[PDB]
Ligand binder design. Structure first.
Ligand SMILES: O=S(=O)(O)c1cccc2cccc(Nc3ccccc3)c12
Length: 159
């Protein structure tokens, strides 16, 4: 079955620039700006569109070794990105996949709002609990803030 979670986050970075950096260049930026959270990102297959698979490795001491993420859809106009966690970490005999969707929306103050949906697809109704969701949210926030800080400090990056 499916467990659905929605949340929102904010940024002081305009939507298009944040999308370009945080979504379209995460394979390069995440290990650079958040080495304590992400040890490396490997492209396994594909040229960036639907079906592209990446292997995201975590540092020593983290709960999980790695996850493999698959790009589902990328909307460069509406700043929407969909991807699924398809192997590693929590995925296995109790969890088939995590299907994620992010949309970045401009605000009039020059910032943005990130609208985030995560759908956990379980095998044999193994309850997804608050603790896993909390962890995932903390990681996403850590990554967002690290990228934000980088974009604040490097004005010529991603215009
Ligand atoms: O989707 S993520 O890419 O991790 C993500 C990316 C960027 C910011 C996020 C902020 C809060 C929660 C997230 N994840 C989350 C995790 C579980 C349930 C609901 C949201 C964020």
């Amino acid at each position: 079955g499916v467990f659905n979670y929605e949340t929102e986050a904010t940024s002081v970075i305009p939507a298009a620039r944040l999308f370009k950096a945080f979504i379209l260049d995460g394979d390069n930026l995440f290990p650079k700006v958040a080495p304590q959270a992400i040890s490396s990102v490997e492209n396994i297959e594909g040229n960036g569109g639907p079906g592209t698979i990446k292997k995201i490795s975590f540092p020593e001491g983290f709960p999980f070794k790695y996850v493999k993420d698959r790009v589902d859809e990328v909307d460069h106009t509406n700043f929407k990105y969909s991807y699924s966690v398809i192997e590693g970490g929590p995925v296995g005999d109790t969890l088939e996949k995590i299907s994620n969707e992010i949309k970045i929306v401009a605000t009039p103050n020059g910032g943005s709002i990130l609208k985030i949906n995560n759908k956990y697809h379980t095998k044999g109704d193994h309850e997804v609990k608050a603790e896993q969701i909390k962890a995932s949210k903390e990681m996403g926030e850590t990554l967002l803030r690290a990228v934000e800080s980088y974009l604040l400090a490097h004005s010529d990056a991603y215009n």
